[PDB]
Design a protein around this ligand. Structure first.
Ligand SMILES: [Mg+2]
Ligand SMILES: [Mg+2]
Ligand SMILES: [Mg+2]
Ligand SMILES: [Mg+2]
Ligand SMILES: [Mg+2]
Ligand SMILES: [Mg+2]
Ligand SMILES: [Mg+2]
Ligand SMILES: [Mg+2]
Ligand SMILES: [Mg+2]
Lengths: 45, 82, 181, 134, 44, 98
RNA sequence: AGAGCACUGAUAGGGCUAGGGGGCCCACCAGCCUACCAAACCCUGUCAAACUCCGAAGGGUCCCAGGUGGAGCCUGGGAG
RNA sequence: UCGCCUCCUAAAAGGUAACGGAGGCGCCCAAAGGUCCCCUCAGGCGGGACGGAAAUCCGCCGGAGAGCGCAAGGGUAGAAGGGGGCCUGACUGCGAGGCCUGCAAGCCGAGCAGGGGCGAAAGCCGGGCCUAGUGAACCGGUGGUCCCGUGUGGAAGGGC
RNA sequence: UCCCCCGUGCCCAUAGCGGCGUGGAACCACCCGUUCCCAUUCCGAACACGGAAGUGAAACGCGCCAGCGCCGAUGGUACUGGGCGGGCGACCGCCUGGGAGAGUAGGUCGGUGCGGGGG
C-alpha cells in the first residue's frame, strides 16, 4: 500500500443515498444530496 | 601637446596549434596523434580514439583515411593491415 | 473494485448516445477518458514551514494516492524564486483512481460552489482539454473543516481522445457537465 | 540603432555588387565612381529634392550609413579614435542606385535628381528606368 | 583548501584537498597504498 | 533512444540484437564490419510454445547449440530499448549456459 | 576574396498585426477607423573585421614519378 | 600595461606585429569525480483558483535558437545536458608512440602487473566537455626509508 | 531469383514537413489484468510480468500530390592565380591558367546489403 486503500461503504447523500464510496473515510454523510436531484436536475425553479 | 593615457584592449592569448596533424593517406605508427582540436569536429573512427581534449590518436599502426558521414560528422579512421 | 457507477454509466450508456448523434466507424474513435491531472497553483506557503507540506496529506483522500511536488528552473526574483527550486504540487490518476474522483466530482463536489450556474461553456481549447478553476476546496466532501487551516485552491485539466472542438463538449454533456448555453 | 561601437575600414575593391536597378520608382540616380557617402549629404540631397516640389512625389533613399567614422582630436598616437565626430557613412560603389523617386513627369524630375546629384563628391548618371527587371 | 590523507594502523600519506566551508569536516575514504594493499585512509 | 547499439560498436563486433514484442522474441547474432547476420534464433519464427519468459530461456539455448559449430564463443550482448530484466535475462542466462 | 540572409545584429518601403497617439461608445473595461509612432511575420531591395546555408584561385602535408642540384641528411671545428 | 584564456586584425596549413578593435583568469566541485540505469530543452499558440507580459499544469507546434559553474570560441540531445543507485581510478609501479617547441617546459596517450569500484556481461575508471584558474632552481618544516653516518658503538646531521 | 512484414546496417533530406488512400491471414502496435520479478521523486504514463474479450482508431509500414523544404546543371558573371599595362589620387584595364555565389530549366514524398517469417 504505503497509503490507505479504498474501503467502500456508503456516502450518505442528504436526499436519500448513494453507495459508490471508496475514497477514504467510509460512513461519510454529506449534506446536500448534491446529485440526487437537489437543484439543477430536471430543472426546478 | 600633452594628452591622455590608456584604454583596455591590448590583452591577448598565445597560440594553441589547432590543426589536423597526420592527413589522409599518411602512414602513421602506434600512439601517434592525428587531430588536435576544440570539441568533436572530426570524430574518432576505426582504430582511433580520444582522451580529455578531443585528441585523435591511432590505436594501431596503419594508414589514415577520411570518410564523411554527412549527418554523423567527420570521421578519421585507421587502416591497419598494410 | 473493478466496477463502479459512472464506470458502468460510461460504457453502458454514454458511448452509444455519442455515436447515434455523431457517427463513428471504428471503436477506438469514441472519446474515452485517458488521464486526469491536478495542479496546485501555490507559491504562497513556499515561505514558512508549518503549513506548506499539509497540502498533500489531504489530496490522497480524493484519489487514494499521494501527490507529487515539483519545481522550476528560470531565475525569477520577483518573489523569492532564487535560481529555481520552488513549490509545485501535482497529482495524476488513472483507472478506478481516475474514476472515483469523477464519481465524486459531479455528484458531491458540486452544489456548494459560489454562484453555481454549471460549468464554463466557453473555456474550450478545441482539443479535448476543457479547463476550470477550483477556488474553494470544502466542496470536496472529505475536505471538512475539523482538520484544515485556510485556502488551498487548484485547477484541473482533462484529457480526451477527441478530435473536434465540439466533440468532447458533447461527451461532457452526458457525464454531468452542465453549461450556460 | 544599437550595433556595437566601431569598425575597421574596407578598401572599395571591385566597383560592383554595391549595385542595383530601379525597383520601386520611376527614375533613379547612379554612381560613376565609389566613395563613402555620409549621413549628412543624404539628408542634404533628400531635402534638396523635396524643396524643388512642395507637396508632391516620394523619394526613395536606398543607402544607409551603417559604418563608423573615426577621427582623433589634434593629439598624437594612442588607442583608436573614438571619432564619429561626423557620425556615420554608407559604403558606396559604382553601379549602385543611390536614390530613385516617383510622382511627377521628367521636366519636374529631370532636375530634382540633377540637383541632389550635385550634393555628391562622385559623378552621377540619372537612370530613366529601362524595364530590364530581374 | 589543502589536505592530505594517511591510512589506518600505519602512517603513510597521499595527496588531495578539502574545502571546509562546504560542510565537509571529517574526510575519510579508501585508497590504494604502495605498502600493504588497499585499506582505509584518513587525514591530518 | 538506443545508445548501447553504439556502446558495443566501440568494442569488438558480434552484435546480439534482441527484439522483444508482446508475444514474440527474436534473437540474432549479427556482425558489423561485414554487416551481415548469422545465427537467427527465434521462437515465434521457430516453433516454440507461448509462455514468454520460460520460452526465451530456450531460444537462448539455441544459438549456443547452433553457433558453437560455426566458430563462435565471444559474447557481445545488445540490449535494445529493453532493460536487462525478465525475458532478456532468461534469453541471455541460457546463452553461455548453453 | 566573392556572394548570400538560413544563424548574429543593422536598414528603406509596403503589407497584415501585439501596444500606445487623435476621435466616440464619454466610462462595465473592453471595442472600430486612423496621411501617427511601433516590434512579431511576409514580399520588394539591401549592410558587416569579430554573421556564414555556400565557396575559390591559391596554401600545407603523405604516396608515386621526373628531377645530380654546391639537393637534401648526420657528426664535429669555427664564426658572424 | 608586464603572466595566462576566447574571437577578429591573421591576407582559407601552423604562426604573425602595432599605446589596434572587443571580452576573461589567479577561482572552484565529495559531488560538478567514476560505473550502471531513467529522462531530453528554450520559445510559441490555446485553455487553466492564486500571481500574472512571465510561478506549478495540460493539448498541440517546437532539431537546438535552452542547458553544459564563471569571458569567448569550438563542440554537443545518436549527451558532454537534467535525476537515482553503488563507489574513490583526484590509485601505485611503469609506460610504446607522438602534438608544440631554441632550452626548460607544457600536452595526449594505447599496453602490462598489484589491488579495487561499477555493471548480469561487452566494457569503462590513471579527475571534471575542452581550451585559462599558475612558479625553474636555492633555503628551510612535517611523515616514512634495506641508506651514509668520520677509530668503534649509540647519538647529531645528511640522503631517497 | 522476385513481393509483403519484422529485426537491422550502410549512402546521409532527390529519405524531411503536410495532406490524401491502403494494410490486420502472419507480422507489430494499440488493448485486458496488475497475482508474482521490476517500477513511478503521485500514477502499470513509461520499464515489467501474465495474456486473448476488442481493434487497426492511434502509433507504424506501403502507394499518390508538390504547397513548404531540399537537390540543382549548362550558360554568363564577380573573384583569382601568374605575366603586363593606365591614372599621383580613390581605382581600372589586357592576356593564360583556374573557375564561383546566388538566380533559371529541371529533380525530388528515397536507394541498398544481411538474416528471419509469410507469400
Ligand atoms: Mg584537440
Ligand atoms: Mg568510510
Ligand atoms: Mg610505509
Ligand atoms: Mg583498497
Ligand atoms: Mg567581403
Ligand atoms: Mg623522386
Ligand atoms: Mg559529469
Ligand atoms: Mg547545459
Ligand atoms: Mg503464392
Amino acid at each position: 500500500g504505503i497509503h490507505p486503500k479504498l474501503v467502500p461503504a456508503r456516502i450518505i447523500c442528504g436526499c436519500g443515498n448513494v453507495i459508490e464510496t471508496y475514497s477514504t473515510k467510509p460512513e461519510i454523510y454529506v449534506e446536500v444530496c448534491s446529485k440526487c436531484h437537489p437543484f439543477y436536475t430536471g430543472q426546478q425553479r | 601637446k600633452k594628452g591622455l593615457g590608456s584604454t583596455r584592449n591590448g590583452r591577448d592569448s598565445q597560440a594553441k596549434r589547432l590543426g589536423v596533424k597526420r592527413y589522409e593517406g599518411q602512414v602513421v605508427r602506434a600512439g601517434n596523434i592525428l587531430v588536435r582540436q576544440r570539441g568533436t569536429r572530426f570524430k574518432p573512427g576505426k582504430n582511433v580514439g580520444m582522451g580529455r581534449d578531443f585528441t585523435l590518436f591511432a590505436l594501431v599502426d596503419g594508414v589514415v583515411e577520411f570518410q564523411d558521414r554527412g549527418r554523423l560528422g567527420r570521421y578519421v579512421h585507421v587502416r591497419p593491415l598494410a | 473494485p473493478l466496477d463502479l457507477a459512472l464506470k458502468r454509466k460510461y460504457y453502458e450508456e454514454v458511448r452509444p448516445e455519442l455515436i447515434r448523434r455523431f457517427g463513428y466507424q471504428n471503436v477506438w474513435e469514441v472519446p474515452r477518458l485517458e488521464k486526469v491531472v491536478i495542479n496546485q497553483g501555490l507559491g504562497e506557503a513556499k515561505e514558512d514551514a508549518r503549513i506548506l507540506e499539509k497540502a498533500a496529506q489531504e489530496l490522497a483522500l480524493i484519489t487514494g494516492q499521494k501527490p507529487a511536488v515539483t519545481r522550476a528552473k528560470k531565475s525569477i526574483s520577483n518573489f523569492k524564486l532564487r535560481k529555481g527550486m520552488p513549490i509545485g504540487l501535482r497529482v495524476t490518476l488513472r483507472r478506478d483512481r481516475m474514476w472515483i474522483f469523477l464519481e465524486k466530482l459531479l455528484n458531491v463536489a458540486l452544489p456548494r460552489i459560489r454562484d453555481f450556474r454549471g460549468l464554463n461553456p466557453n473555456s474550450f481549447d478545441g482539443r479535448g482539454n476543457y479547463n476550470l478553476g477550483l477556488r474553494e476546496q470544502l466542496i470536496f466532501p472529505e475536505i471538512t473543516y475539523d482538520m484544515v487551516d485556510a485556502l488551498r485552491g487548484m485547477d484541473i485539466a482533462v484529457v480526451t481522445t477527441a478530435e473536434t472542438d465540439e466533440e468532447a463538449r458533447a461527451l461532457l454533456e452526458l457525464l454531468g457537465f452542465p453549461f450556460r448555453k | 540603432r544599437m550595433k556595437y561601437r566601431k569598425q575597421q575600414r574596407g578598401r572599395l575593391k571591385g566597383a560592383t555588387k554595391g549595385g542595383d536597378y530601379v525597383a520601386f520608382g520611376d527614375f533613379g540616380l547612379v554612381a560613376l565612381e565609389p566613395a563613402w557617402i555620409t549621413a549628412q549629404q543624404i539628408e542634404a540631397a533628400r531635402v534638396a529634392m523635396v524643396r524643388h516640389f512642395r507637396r508632391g512625389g516620394k523619394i526613395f533613399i536606398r543607402i544607409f550609413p551603417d559604418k563608423p567614422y573615426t577621427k582623433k582630436p589634434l593629439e598624437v598616437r594612442m588607442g583608436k579614435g573614438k571619432g564619429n565626430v561626423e557620425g556615420y557613412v554608407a559604403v558606396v560603389k559604382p553601379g549602385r542606385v543611390m536614390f530613385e523617386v516617383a510622382g511627377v513627369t521628367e521636366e519636374q524630375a529631370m532636375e530634382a535628381l540633377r540637383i541632389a546629384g550635385h550634393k555628391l563628391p562622385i559623378k552621377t548618371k540619372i537612370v530613366r528606368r529601362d524595364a530590364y527587371d530581374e | 583548501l589543502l589536505l592530505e590523507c594517511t591510512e589506518c594502523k600505519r602512517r603513510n600519506y597521499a595527496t588531495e584537498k578539502n574545502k571546509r566551508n562546504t560542510p565537509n569536516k571529517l574526510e575519510l575514504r579508501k585508497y590504494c597504498p604502495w605498502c600493504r594493499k588497499h585499506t582505509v585512509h584518513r587525514e591530518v | 533512444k538506443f545508445r548501447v547499439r553504439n556502446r558495443i560498436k566501440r568494442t569488438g563486433r558480434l552484435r546480439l540484437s534482441v527484439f522483444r514484442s508482446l508475444k514474440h522474441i527474436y534473437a540474432q547474432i549479427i556482425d558489423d564490419e561485414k554487416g551481415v547476420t548469422l545465427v537467427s534464433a527465434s521462437s515465434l519464427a521457430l516453433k516454440l510454445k507461448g509462455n514468454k519468459t520460460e520460452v526465451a530461456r530456450q531460444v537462448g539455448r539455441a544459438l549456443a547449440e547452433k553457433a558453437l559449430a560455426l566458430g563462435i564463443k565471444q559474447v557481445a550482448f545488445d540490449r535494445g530499448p529493453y532493460k536487462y530484466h525478465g525475458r532478456v535475462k532468461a534469453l541471455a542466462e541460457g546463452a553461455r549456459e548453453g
